Amino acid sequence: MDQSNRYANLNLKESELIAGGRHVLCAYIMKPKAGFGNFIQTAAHFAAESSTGTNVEVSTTDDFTRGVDALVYEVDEANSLMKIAYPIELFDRNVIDGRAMIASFLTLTIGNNQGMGDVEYAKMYDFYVPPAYLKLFDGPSTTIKDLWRVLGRPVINGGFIVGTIIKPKLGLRPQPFANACYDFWLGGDFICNDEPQGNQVFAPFKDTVRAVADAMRRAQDKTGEAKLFSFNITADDHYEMLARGEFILETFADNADHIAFLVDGYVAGPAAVTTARRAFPKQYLHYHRAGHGAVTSPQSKRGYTAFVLSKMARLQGASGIHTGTMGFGKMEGEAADRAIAYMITEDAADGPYFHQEWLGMNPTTPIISGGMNALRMPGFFDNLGHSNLIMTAGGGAFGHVDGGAAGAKSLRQAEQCWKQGADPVEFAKDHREFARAFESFPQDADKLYPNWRAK
Amino acid sequence: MDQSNRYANLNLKESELIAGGRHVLCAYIMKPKAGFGNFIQTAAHFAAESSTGTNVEVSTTDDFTRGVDALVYEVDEANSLMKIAYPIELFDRNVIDGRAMIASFLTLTIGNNQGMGDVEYAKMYDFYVPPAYLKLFDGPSTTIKDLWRVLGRPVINGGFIVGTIIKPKLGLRPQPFANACYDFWLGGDFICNDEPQGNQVFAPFKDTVRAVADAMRRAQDKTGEAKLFSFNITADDHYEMLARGEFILETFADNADHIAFLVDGYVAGPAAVTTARRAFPKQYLHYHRAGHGAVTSPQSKRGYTAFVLSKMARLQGASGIHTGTMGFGKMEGEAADRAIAYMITEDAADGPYFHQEWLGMNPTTPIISGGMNALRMPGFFDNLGHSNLIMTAGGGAFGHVDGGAAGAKSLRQAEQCWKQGADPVEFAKDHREFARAFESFPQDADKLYPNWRAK
Amino acid sequence: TTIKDLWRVLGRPVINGGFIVGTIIKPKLGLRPQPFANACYDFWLGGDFICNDEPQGNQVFAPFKDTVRAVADAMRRAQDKTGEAKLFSFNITADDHYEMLARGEFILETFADNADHIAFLVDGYVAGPAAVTTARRAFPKQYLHYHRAGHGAVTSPQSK
Ligand SMILES: O=C(O)[C@@](O)(COP(=O)(O)O)[C@H](O)[C@H](O)COP(=O)(O)O
Ligand SMILES: O=C(O)[C@@](O)(COP(=O)(O)O)[C@H](O)[C@H](O)COP(=O)(O)O
Ligand SMILES: [Mg+2]
Ligand SMILES: [Mg+2]
Ligand SMILES: [Mg+2]
Secondary structure, three states, X not given: OOOHHHHEOOOOOHHHHHHHOOEEEEEEEEEEOOOOOOHHHHHHHHHHOOOOOOOOOOOOOOHHHHHOOOEEEEEEHHHOEEEEEEEHHHOOEOOOOOOEOHHHHHHHHHOHHHHEOOEEEEEEEEEEOOHHHHOOOOOOOOOHHHHHHHHOOOOOOOOOEEEEEOXXXXXXXXXXXXXXXXXXXXXXXXXXXXXXXXXXXXXXXXXXXXXXXXXXHHHHHHHOOOOEEEEEOOOOOHHHHHHHHHHHHHHHHHHHHHEEEEEEHHHHOHHHHHHHHHHOOOOEEEEEXXXXXXXXXXXXXXXXXXHHHHHHHHHHOOOEEEOOOOOOOOEOOOHHHHHHHHHHHOOEEEOOOOEEEOOOXXXXXXXXXXXXXXXXXXXXXXXXXXXXXXXXXXHHHHOOOOOHHHHHHHHHXXXXXXXXXXXXXXXXXOOHHHHHHHHHOHHHHHHHOOOOOOO | OXXXXXXXXXXXXXXXHHHHOOEEEEEEEEEEOOOOOOHHHHHHHHHHOOOOOOOOOOOOOOHHHHHOOOEEEEEEHHHOEEEEEEEHXXXXXXXXXOOEOHHHHHHHHXXXXXXXXXXXXXXXXXXXXXXXXXXXXXXXOOOHHHHHHHHOOOOOOOXXXXXXXXXXXXXXXXXXXXXXHHHHHOOOOEEEOOOOOOOEOOEOHHHHHHHHHHHHHHHHHHHOOOOEEEEEOOOOXXXXXXXXXXXXXXXHHHHHHHEEEEEEOOOOOHHHHHHHHXXXXXXXXXXXXXXXXXXXXXXXXXXXXXXXXXXXXXXXXXXXXXXXXXXXXXXXXXXXXXXXXXHXXXXXXEOOOOEEEOOOOOOOEEEEOOOOOHHHHHHHHHHHOOOOOEEEOHHHHHOOOOOHHXXXXXXXXXXXXXXXXXXXXXXXXXXXXXXXXXXXXXXXXXXXXXXXXXX | OOHHHHHHHHOOXXXXXXXXXXXXXXXXXXXXXXXXXXXXXXXXXXXXXXXXXOOOOOEOOEOHHHHHHXXXXXXXXXXXXXXXXXXXXXXXXXXXXXXXXXXXXXXHHHHHHHHHHEEEEEEHHHHOHHHHHHHHHHOOOOEEEEEOOOOHHHHOOOOO
């Protein structure tokens, strides 16, 4: 069935749709399946399955329904580009507070349309939210601004937060776990659970937070500096998440504002992110995206990109989200991913297709992690352009030849080397922990800094 | 770094791992990326990133950690097959009730490993859960038995539940919405919100619930038969979901056990499914999987299959889940998808790689939907083998030439034709509504029943 | 919840799983927390199921939380010794709905990975259906052990 006459109107101007403030815009890279309709016909059915229609005509459709149709307003078959405008009245709102829910945005814009039989693949690369809809999202209530204040840093451009993940990913019992935290905090600022750490039978939850809380006090008394920890409170059950958060804040007591909450937002879902965002709005929400690569990978032509994921996370209320190492780490990523960081940190930024005004919505910190170490940091900061962020290096810290404490300092000195604009090799001659990272990761040192042993 | 000696033990026998009952087994179709390690090396790193390790050695690892390593126990590079055994001590448990959470299972078995830069793609096709771990999942609390009992049907093999989705997907105001519910209920059993219908400004939630409630009373008074409705309560906020469900049950009063709750479990996440499962255990939980096609599609070689998704849904507590039309509808699907239905309905069933014993865990109803109508139904039931299920036809019902009421009866008569083993064309000679479905969908009638006009 | 769910924990067939060997901790009252747990350990060496005697709860000589923690420890010791799963049914009866919740919530949390080994005993006759429903609707996935103390006042054939 050809529904292009109804669900496609290419005469609409994107600039007039934006100025109207009545439409969410989505840009897709789509390819029709062979043996069905052409590009515009497929894009039309795509819009029908994403708003008001199905695959056949129904007697219950009226002129009002047609008024809220999602409309294909731009196509470019040569580049497989498809843009669709969704009237904002389509998106579901809370009965309790009239606010928006990202779950409805996902259901319409990238839900059933991912299973259509007449489409080979379709992936969202960008979207635009107008003010009337943008302001209905929670946004972040805590930012890096609040971590800086705890660390004693300036609340404007407070700078780099040295971080790590406790490794092994799983296996450490409570006290060995806390001993590693104490070691790293002797030279570092931030520690977080590895995404799956929680209440394993060999490392009970409450036993572990108590041991970490003791380590934090010991590290703070020893170094005279404040230390931060991010606990994983992900769970299927809403009330399990609350129980973990409430116990943590109470146990850490006067160090409760040193605590962040980690959520595996992708596999647990927006509901888990919103649970932590609204239950603990004054606790830095640490968005972990394990599993995102199933759709975000460039190898995938379905779902949505990491850019789309990061932009959505800011609406959900993530204080910080993993944005990837941008090609400098062990995970898939590219240097152009720095545009993701600007989109979630700035009040105004450009996506691959749409410019976004955030209207003073709080920024989401870009959390850098994934095979990072002191040797890989200078090049990363060169690509991004700033270091007002959190970086966690698990293997990069506890894989240091001289231990986690030395690993912590190697990250500190690496960012100081970039801030000073110094040559890493020459800078290492006066910074032992940074120099020892070359011996800790000789393969990386050989590729990044040829002939480093000779200097 | 080569980690095959630690994270690979191909001398392990799958039959002993199963008999031991101490390991979750996962089968993946994996392909290493060019320019890195061979197959066993990639599979070993894959297992490390999915349990206890990272991409480098760390000083904190002890023997206890090594004991809980996930182990590659079987490979077949020719077919890109990789099997991994996850010790069940790795998976997180609730502090409040010590039960399992699917979020932990997803984070480890299909989380970070989807973003590994040394892997081109990896997709889970099957998994095995031993008794010690299986019995810790919620499982369904409400089944089709309870819908049959409300309909007055036998609680064993109660038969086919004629259903539909209110179309248009969006745009109907409260009372027009309810009028369409009444029309279909005159010949059908089951009606559900379309996945995005909820609290749109043009169709307020409470006004729609009240109008549908009145429609149910009018239809039951008119037909003398019980009627069912499945309301979408999906939301980011746990408390929004409770608010919608509590209001529905109070409004419907003595028809409260006629209510099912629909959840967009894929975009909202397991947390949303669990909210409905645990807050409303005695309300049929209707799992909707909008967005799943981004990973489950055979066009995708990442994430997991629809079989994996359905099996998890049964553990999560879904009373029913969409299993696709198995190639007979408008969405992607194949005839072999009937194995998904058997896996969620039987106490013992075979997956593509692992046999599963469910130990009496309640079944999940296979909900058939997606471009279905009376003409396509006989073929679908021949491939499945039974009709003890829910089938919803939005366009197939309200697209009927004579309206939703006649469309409802066409679906009823379509299954009666299959139960009687009659020829559709000949059966239509004595069943008006079914015959008029040929006129409603002539393109389908021409392909499925050549020369139907002459008879 | 049904005996099916106790059979599953014990490793029995979920249909016709067979006989569950059980006892009540005697004395009915008087045992202090650790002697109470020591009796639980002894029986579990040969049995499956243990329940509070109907009035056992939070007596001054046997505080509730201390007894729950000691019984929880005994269950691990007996399961680690025998290699078999063990079950316990705690009395959570109380006039105050929120007392019943407090008790049940603390038990499940304390037993942790053995939480599915726990049943909840309710003196349904003297406490009433309201107490039964509290346990039924607050803890649907915990075996509800209905104790009928006091029923003999009306059910006895001597009564008309
Ligand atoms: O498990 C891991 O691999 C990490 O803890 C990094 O460990 P290392 O520091 O040892 O590399 C992070 O979870 C990933 O970086 C997530 O990827 P991303 O940030 O791209 O979402
Ligand atoms: O929006 C729709 O398209 C449907 O209401 C079907 O409508 P029609 O009956 O009118 O076609 C269902 O939500 C999809 O079938 C879900 O797909 P699946 O079950 O494959 O996950
Ligand atoms: Mg990690
Ligand atoms: Mg639908
Ligand atoms: Mg007694």
